[PDB]
Amino acid sequence: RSYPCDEKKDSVIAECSNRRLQEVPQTVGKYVTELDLSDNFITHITNESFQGLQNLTKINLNHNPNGLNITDGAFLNLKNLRELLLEDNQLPQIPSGLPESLTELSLIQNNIYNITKEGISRLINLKNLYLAWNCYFNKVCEKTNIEDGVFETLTNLELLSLSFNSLSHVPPKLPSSLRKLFLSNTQIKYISEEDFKGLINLTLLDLSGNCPRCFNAPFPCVPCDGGASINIDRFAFQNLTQLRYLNLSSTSLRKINAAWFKNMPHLKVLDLEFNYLVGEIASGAFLTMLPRLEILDLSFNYIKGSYPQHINISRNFSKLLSLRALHLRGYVFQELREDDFQPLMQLPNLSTINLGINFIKQIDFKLFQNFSNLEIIYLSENRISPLFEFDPHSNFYHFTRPLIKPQCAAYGKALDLSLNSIFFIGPNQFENLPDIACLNLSANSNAQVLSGTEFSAIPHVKYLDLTNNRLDFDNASALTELSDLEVLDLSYNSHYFRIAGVTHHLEFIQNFTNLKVLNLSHNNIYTLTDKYNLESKSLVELVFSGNRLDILWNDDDNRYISIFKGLKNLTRLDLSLNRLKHIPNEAFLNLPASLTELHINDNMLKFFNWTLLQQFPRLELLDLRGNKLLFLTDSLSDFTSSLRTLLLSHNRISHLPSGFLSEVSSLKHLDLSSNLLKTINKSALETKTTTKLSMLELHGNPFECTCDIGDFRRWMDEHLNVKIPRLVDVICASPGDQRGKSIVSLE
Amino acid sequence: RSYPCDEKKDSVIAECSNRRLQEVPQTVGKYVTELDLSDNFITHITNESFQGLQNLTKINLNHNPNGLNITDGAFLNLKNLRELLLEDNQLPQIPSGLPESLTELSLIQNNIYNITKEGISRLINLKNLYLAWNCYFNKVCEKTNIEDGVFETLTNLELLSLSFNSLSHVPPKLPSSLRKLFLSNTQIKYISEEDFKGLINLTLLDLSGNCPRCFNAPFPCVPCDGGASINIDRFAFQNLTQLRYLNLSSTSLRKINAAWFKNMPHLKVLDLEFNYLVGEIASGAFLTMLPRLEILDLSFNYIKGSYPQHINISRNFSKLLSLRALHLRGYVFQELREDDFQPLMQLPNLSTINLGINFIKQIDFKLFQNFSNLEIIYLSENRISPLFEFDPHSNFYHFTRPLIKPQCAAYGKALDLSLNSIFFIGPNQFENLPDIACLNLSANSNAQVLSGTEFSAIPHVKYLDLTNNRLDFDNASALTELSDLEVLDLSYNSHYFRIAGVTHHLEFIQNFTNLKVLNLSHNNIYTLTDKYNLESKSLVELVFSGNRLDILWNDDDNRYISIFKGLKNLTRLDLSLNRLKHIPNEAFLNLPASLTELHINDNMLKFFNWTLLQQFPRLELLDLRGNKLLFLTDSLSDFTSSLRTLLLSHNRISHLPSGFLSEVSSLKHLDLSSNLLKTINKSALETKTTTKLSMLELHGNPFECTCDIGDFRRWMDEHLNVKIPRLVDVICASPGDQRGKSIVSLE
Numbered sequence A, B: 001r002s003y004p005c006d007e008k009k010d011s012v013i014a015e016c017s018n019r020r021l022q023e024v025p026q027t028v029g030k031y032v033t034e035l036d037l038s039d040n041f042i043t044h045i046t047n048e049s050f051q052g053l054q055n056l057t058k059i060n061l062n063h064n065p066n067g068l069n070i071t072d073g074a075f076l077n078l079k080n081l082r083e084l085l086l087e088d089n090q091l092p093q094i095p096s097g098l099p100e101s102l103t104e105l106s107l108i109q110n111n112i113y114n115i116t117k118e119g120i121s122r123l124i125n126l127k128n129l130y131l132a133w134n135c136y137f138n139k140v141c142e143k144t145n146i147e148d149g150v151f152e153t154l155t156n157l158e159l160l161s162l163s164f165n166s167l168s169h170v171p172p173k174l175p176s177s178l179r180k181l182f183l184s185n186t187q188i189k190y191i192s193e194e195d196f197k198g199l200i201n202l203t204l205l206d207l208s209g210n211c212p213r214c215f216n217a218p219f220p221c222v223p224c225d226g227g228a229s230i231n232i233d234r235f236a237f238q239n240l241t242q243l244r245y246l247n248l249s250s251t252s253l254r255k256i257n258a259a260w261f262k263n264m265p266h267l268k269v270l271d272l273e274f275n276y277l278v279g280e281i282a283s284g285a286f287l288t289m290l291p292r293l294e295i296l297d298l299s300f301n302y303i304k305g306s307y308p309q310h311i312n313i314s315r316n317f318s319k320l321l322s323l324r325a326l327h328l329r330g331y332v333f334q335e336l337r338e339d340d341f342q343p344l345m346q347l348p349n350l351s352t353i354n355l356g357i358n359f360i361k362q363i364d365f366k367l368f369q370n371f372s373n374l375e376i377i378y379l380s381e382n383r384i385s386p387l388f389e390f391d392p393h394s395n396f397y398h399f400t401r402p403l404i405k406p407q408c409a410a411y412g413k414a415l416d417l418s419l420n421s422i423f424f425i426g427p428n429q430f431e432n433l434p435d436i437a438c439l440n441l442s443a444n445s446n447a448q449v450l451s452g453t454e455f456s457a458i459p460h461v462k463y464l465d466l467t468n469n470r471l472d473f474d475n476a477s478a479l480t481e482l483s484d485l486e487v488l489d490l491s492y493n494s495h496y497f498r499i500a501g502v503t504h505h506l507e508f509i510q511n512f513t514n515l516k517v518l519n520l521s522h523n524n525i526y527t528l529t530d531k532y533n534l535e536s537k538s539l540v541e542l543v544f545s546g547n548r549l550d551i552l553w554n555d556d557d558n559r560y561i562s563i564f565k566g567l568k569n570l571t572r573l574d575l576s577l578n579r580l581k582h583i584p585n586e587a588f589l590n591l592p593a594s595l596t597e598l599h600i601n602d603n604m605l606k607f608f609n610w611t612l613l614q615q616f617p618r619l620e621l622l623d624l625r626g627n628k629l630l631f632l633t634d635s636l637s638d639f640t641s642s643l644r645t646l647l648l649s650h651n652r653i654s655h656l657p658s659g660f661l662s663e664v665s666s667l668k669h670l671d672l673s674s675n676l677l678k679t680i681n682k683s684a685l686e687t688k689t690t691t692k693l694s695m696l697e698l699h700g701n702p703f704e705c706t707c708d709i710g711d712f713r714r715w716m717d718e719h720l721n722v723k724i725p726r727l728v729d730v731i732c733a734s735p736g737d738q739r740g741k742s743i744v745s746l747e
């Protein structure tokens, strides 16, 4: 049994990260090809650390310890080591005597201020070299010395990242093999005609954050004198004929030279965020030179102190024939009129329009249907009313998550109006819109009494997000015009639900013949009007977490005893976070017999009636994590032949009954972590049959490592293929001389 | 080392199929959850076959042997057996005493004519039961007796397949749990009001092939008397409110009762192929009752002997608001005019139109751009000119592969004009078309001299399929108007290439700045005009199989010695099937130094100069399978530190040199199957280092199983994680007493 790592198997990974290791383990399998030792407490690497492990092609030593001392030549023996990750190790230098086999080396987030021939010029197979984020913001550090011609040797180098270092000039003598060159936030003020003249293979150039626009910066930001623009020679990009990505965000551009793009016939992504380009947006010649451009980001180009009535888009936007996505967040303007987006309306592939964070107060919605074919109309975070801190592997200037959840966007055209002030829905709000399938009205503080007409103009919504509002369910016909609805999210509408004296009608749920997923979480539901039962022939999943089943199922009240029984198709039910101390037997018995997955985690349960599992013959997963359960039934084998996964972590169990690990015929995964087990008896292991488990989780119990643990230790050896994860965290609490050892120590 | 099965690891599969096993192996790992024993020579199953293997949830015994004798209660001990596959085993009955744990049982393609309570009524957890294809066509077999109420017990049954059995009537007493009911080709002539009256959960109903349309059938086909229609009671489908799929193909329908669909508000797929519905296509009321229908298949509804001028589509097609795909193959008509498809033109989601196999002679192509948004215009196999045999798990009436290759369709709008008679391209052929990205002109016997203007009206093609034509490359500007082209398929244009006295100009390949993949296979290329070199800065993959490099690289001719050198970006090169007996050193040396993958398989090579691998430092895969190589270099370790996979199966190698399995630092996968190895020496195994292999293939060598094989056998035990597949086929050829044993036998 592999220790302290967990092995996964076109290569074999030893997962050994975040395990408190104070040394490289000397027990790595000889068949391992990738070794992850990140996030431990390792302080020395030498030539003995990985002795003879010639199958290792990748080693991850990021974030050690929690500086890392690597001797000269420590890795030199590894003849096929290709990838070495040494991020966030407080290194003062590039380690010497690295193996010539390397194709990827990462030294991100260290204290390296000297890039030398001695450290890298021998690494002639290098393909990707990451040196970003060694000297930046208000760190105490030195300007980076790049030894003249250090990279010139590296004739296979395709990616070089030097961002977030103090460089002052583009390094000379770069190899023409480069494809991707990242020089963001390097304090370069001037790009010469010579800087990139031989980089005829380059596909990506990142010059962002040189002469930055520092107003309202979320980091320590140092502008060029006067807040001046980066200075880019007219001929700087003359031979960059392979460029697809160009990042000039936060370079304090006021002017774009259209002829910069004369010899980039492939440019596909242009990032121009956080500049001063309102004037170029209105009249820019560069827009005519980009007929293959797919993504244009012009976000945060606002004029400080200016709140113009309208956005001013050049007619030359009509020449962006391949455009797919246009991001215009943070331009800052009051009203969007149809005439204002005329230049975009014939572009055949413009599918995403992003107008987030513009403080727009009014939109002429009819305009969107006159575009050729929008699929994402993203208007989140405006003012519409009724009609180390930075991840070095992510984008610095924006989030990269999808604008609209993929599960909602998969249904078809999407309109996102979240985080505005559309506090009620008037009879004309959705007039003249495309056939919207995905609608987001989250966080509009909406208090509407939905009554069956409000979405009549967009009646084919399939995924509706009404979260974080204050909906008032006073009318049983709410939402019944949406006949095709499949997903409804009503999470965080507690406002009226918490008030006993107003009405709460959830009758409408029965009207949907296509509804599959319903989220009622965090509504503080404790009382309903007239009809006490939820009913649906179609619903498969109900999330009811964060409500008050403790009240609904109070022992003095019989009204809600079948609240979910009428969800005749239900397979997944989440009752977590409902303050439950015990469930009435009759209420448990009235849960739908169709259930396969039942979550009751994070309640306060001291009692569970196991016998009632006899009435759920399709139940595969039962989650009771995070409760106060003091004991387990001794008869689970009599109550289920379907249960596959039983999650019981974070309870107060101190004894495992006879047969618990063997007798349930279908049980594969049993999580008993973070309970109060001191031992596991022989009788628990085996009765008439032998275990069918494939995973048993036990970390965080106070095991007693006397000879009384001997039967379980022998059982572990007889049953190697029962995975017990985190053996390093399956720790003797006693006796004193064994405290802190994994139970897997001692004999 | 697991034998005779190969183990793969949320479950562990023992792959044990097609290994000539004459008995269930008694060596299955106790941790195995799915056991595949299909396609062996097993003839008996008893209660000893799977004794104690309580982790088995799935067993596949299909196609044994190559009848299978299963004793009463043989599987009864397995308490969690869920899936049992027993297809094509010549069973005369349902096995008795099957385990109550079963949720899936397949008895497809047996000799079972009796469905009895004794066999199935105890299986109350069954969810899917397959009994199809036990009595059909001209098999000698009996009508199926279904014991009254046999399925009524099965209150969890969701899928029941009885197709291709002689049933005569729908069985009574079906459980209302059913979701999918397949009764294709069951000789049922009449559907009563009672037949499906309680099936309120049904989503799929398959009644195809009852009262079949037998003209030109590719199987023995028995029509209803007179060729009459199936007889479906008006109220037959009255309660099938959950139906999404309805298959009435080949039921000899002339009339569709529109009110059959009155209570199917969810119907999504309607299959009506091989009927007599020309009159209903022209005027059918049913088209108004299907506003959620996505796929309509009306293929092969032609009137025998009739070749009308035009197709006649009802205006009611305009009511099919959700339609995505319309299949109208085999209607048979002469000309497609714009007025004829008016009813389809406003449907917003109609993305696929399939008019295959109509013998259409003329098309008004401008019509397609007036649809709302077609993405697949499939006109393959028409007459346009210049302007057991059946897989029981597939569809019986059509192929299910995508109409257009997904790699071509991923680029955008697709027009497939393959298998017509467009034998030259005139100046107006592609006028008035949408912006086509994927164009298929395969198999039009096209002899055009392409000259740089023929695709001017559709200049943004990205994936062009010109295979199986007779292109005449007399003009160096061919195809140069397609500036965005990324994939070009010129396979099987040997016609003019085989003629020495006509010109062959391939200069144009250099003009494409986006070209990634070029297929020149099967062109019999042996001579080019003026320029002897292929050149491209962008190309990554060239397929040159099936040409005459043997001639191009003849020792008396220096003209083609750098033919591929100018493909400066190339990583994948396929030179298979070029009749090569030896490659000139200088020609091998002139292959691009960028190569990662090089295929020279299926030539006639007796010589390979291994030393020349020193000039390919990115080479990862080398494929030399299917040649005549008599020996291997002894120095491969000196010639490469990049080679990962070396494929040498089907050559004539009889000795492995010292260090072959250990000394190449990067070599992981070595295929030496089907050579003439008698032994593997100690020195081959290990020299300064020890093996880095993770896979070694050795099946089909004539091994000598004397004590001289002892060093290799010990090495196999020391190196368990070097996978040697198919140990059953790694067979002693000698001595006589060991012949036929796996080398893994004997000590």
Ligand SMILES: *[C@@H]1O[C@H](CO)[C@@H](O[C@@H]2O[C@H](CO)[C@@H](O[C@@H]3O[C@H](CO)[C@@H](O)[C@H](O)[C@@H]3O)[C@H](O)[C@H]2NC(C)=O)[C@H](O)[C@H]1NC(C)=O
Pocket (backbone or CB within 6 Å): A380, A401, A403, A404, A405, A408, A418, A419, A440, A441, A442, A443, A465
């Ligand atoms: C409707 O609009 C709301 C508000 O814009 C969307 O809420 C946002 O949803 C995203 C995506 O899930 C949340 O980001 C994620 O958060 C977690 C951190 O807890 C992280 O694991 C992910 O990496 C990701 O960043 C975001 O915080 C949340 N914003 C707010 C204010 O709640 C919602 O997704 C939209 N609905 C649809 C259907 O698109």
Ligand SMILES: *[C@@H]1O[C@H](CO)[C@@H](O[C@@H]2O[C@H](CO)[C@@H](O[C@@H]3O[C@H](CO)[C@@H](O)[C@H](O)[C@@H]3O)[C@H](O)[C@H]2NC(C)=O)[C@H](O)[C@H]1NC(C)=O
Pocket (backbone or CB within 6 Å): A407, A408, A467, A487, A489, A491, A517, A518, A519, A521, A541, A543
């Ligand atoms: C309200 O309840 C729904 C239903 O549970 C929540 O949406 C669901 O959120 C889960 C993630 O918690 C999604 O599952 C995940 O899907 C991703 C992408 O396929 C997968 O990679 C993950 O491993 C996991 O399976 C699930 O798809 C999603 N369902 C739908 C219909 O969107 C929703 O987030 C809840 N709302 C609030 C405000 O919490």
Ligand SMILES: *[C@@H]1O[C@H](CO)[C@@H](O[C@@H]2O[C@H](CO)[C@@H](O[C@@H]3O[C@H](CO)[C@@H](O)[C@H](O)[C@@H]3O)[C@H](O)[C@H]2NC(C)=O)[C@H](O)[C@H]1NC(C)=O
Pocket (backbone or CB within 6 Å): B380, B401, B403, B404, B405, B408, B418, B419, B440, B441, B442, B443, B465
């Ligand atoms: C352009 O049109 C031609 C002719 O219609 C297409 O050729 C056809 O391609 C399909 C798909 O690959 C072939 O089917 C496949 O064949 C093999 C059997 O060898 C099988 O492995 C697959 O399961 C599949 O059935 C088909 O035989 C072939 N037809 C002919 C007459 O050659 C071609 O794919 C079209 N090109 C594009 C880009 O879509």
Ligand SMILES: *[C@@H]1O[C@H](CO)[C@@H](O[C@@H]2O[C@H](CO)[C@@H](O[C@@H]3O[C@H](CO)[C@@H](O)[C@H](O)[C@@H]3O)[C@H](O)[C@H]2NC(C)=O)[C@H](O)[C@H]1NC(C)=O
Pocket (backbone or CB within 6 Å): B407, B408, B467, B487, B489, B491, B517, B518, B519, B521, B541, B543
């Ligand atoms: C002419 O040469 C091209 C380039 O090799 C051939 O198309 C390629 O065919 C291979 C299959 O042999 C495709 O790879 C396969 O892709 C599928 C789907 O992703 C994957 O599941 C398989 O495991 C395998 O990777 C490859 O995608 C495809 N390339 C393109 C650009 O379509 C083409 O078939 C050849 N033409 C003739 C007539 O043989």
Ligand SMILES: CCCCc1cc2c(o1)c(N)nc1ccccc12
Pocket (backbone or CB within 6 Å): A302, A304, A307, A330, A332, A357, A359
């Ligand atoms: C996103 C741009 C930062 C400068 C700015 C503009 C505005 C705000 O902040 C800001 N915080 N609120 C506003 C409210 C109405 C109109 C303009 C703004």
Ligand SMILES: CCCCc1cc2c(o1)c(N)nc1ccccc12
Pocket (backbone or CB within 6 Å): B302, B304, B307, B330, B332, B357, B359
């Ligand atoms: C696909 C329909 C089978 C009956 C049929 C019609 C025709 C053929 O076969 C057939 N084989 N060739 C034809 C040529 C021109 C017009 C009609 C046909």
Ligand SMILES: *[C@@H]1O[C@H](CO)[C@@H](O)[C@H](O)[C@H]1NC(C)=O
Pocket (backbone or CB within 6 Å): A044, A045, A046, A069, A070, A071
């Ligand atoms: C680094 O570790 C080595 C031993 O591996 C030790 O001799 C040396 O003192 C350490 N270096 C520093 C700067 O602490």
Ligand SMILES: *[C@@H]1O[C@H](CO)[C@@H](O)[C@H](O)[C@H]1NC(C)=O
Pocket (backbone or CB within 6 Å): A155, A156, A175, A176, A177, A200, A201, B536, B537, B538, B568, B569, B594
């Ligand atoms: C530049 O790219 C080409 C492919 O067109 C390639 O052959 C060349 O090796 C690259 N340049 C280098 C490695 O300097």
Ligand SMILES: *[C@@H]1O[C@H](CO)[C@@H](O)[C@H](O)[C@H]1NC(C)=O
Pocket (backbone or CB within 6 Å): A321, A322, A323, A348, A349, B411, B412, B413, B435, B436, B437, B460
């Ligand atoms: C629009 O997108 C489609 C699908 O990706 C592509 O085929 C087409 O060439 C694009 N049109 C333009 C003008 O780029």
Ligand SMILES: *[C@@H]1O[C@H](CO)[C@@H](O)[C@H](O)[C@H]1NC(C)=O
Pocket (backbone or CB within 6 Å): A338, A339, A342, A345, A346, A370, A371
């Ligand atoms: C709609 O779009 C077209 C361009 O496709 C434009 O000419 C026209 O002015 C727009 N119509 C309206 C009403 O804005």
Ligand SMILES: *[C@@H]1O[C@H](CO)[C@@H](O)[C@H](O)[C@H]1NC(C)=O
Pocket (backbone or CB within 6 Å): A451, A452, A453, A474, A475, A476, A477
């Ligand atoms: C709900 O609102 C509708 C539309 O206003 C109204 O006609 C109906 O009477 C109300 N429904 C109730 C009270 O159930």
Ligand SMILES: *[C@@H]1O[C@H](CO)[C@@H](O)[C@H](O)[C@H]1NC(C)=O
Pocket (backbone or CB within 6 Å): A452, A477, A480, A510, A511
């Ligand atoms: C909602 O469903 C009930 C049947 O349970 C029906 O009485 C009611 O009319 C439906 N309401 C609407 C507006 O469809």
Ligand SMILES: *[C@@H]1O[C@H](CO)[C@@H](O)[C@H](O)[C@H]1NC(C)=O
Pocket (backbone or CB within 6 Å): A513, A516, A537, A538, A539, A540, A569, B201, B203, B242
């Ligand atoms: C029950 O759920 C499944 C899965 O979503 C669905 O196929 C079926 O239509 C549902 N049943 C009903 C009556 O709506």
Ligand SMILES: *[C@@H]1O[C@H](CO)[C@@H](O)[C@H](O)[C@H]1NC(C)=O
Pocket (backbone or CB within 6 Å): A585, A586, A589, A609, A611, A612
């Ligand atoms: C379990 O539930 C049933 C009532 O439904 C009862 O017979 C048995 O007493 C229960 N156990 C407990 C602890 O209430």
Ligand SMILES: *[C@@H]1O[C@H](CO)[C@@H](O)[C@H](O)[C@H]1NC(C)=O
Pocket (backbone or CB within 6 Å): A690, A691, A692, A693, A694, A695, A718, A719, A720, A721, A722, B030, B031, B032, B052, B053, B054, B055
């Ligand atoms: C079932 O598999 C587990 C490993 O997942 C193994 O330890 C156990 O012995 C097996 N049980 C039986 C009865 O074979």
Ligand SMILES: *[C@@H]1O[C@H](CO)[C@@H](O)[C@H](O)[C@H]1NC(C)=O
Pocket (backbone or CB within 6 Å): B044, B045, B046, B069, B070, B071
């Ligand atoms: C089937 O095999 C059993 C032994 O397992 C044997 O007794 C019996 O004769 C066989 N049945 C037939 C019909 O051959």
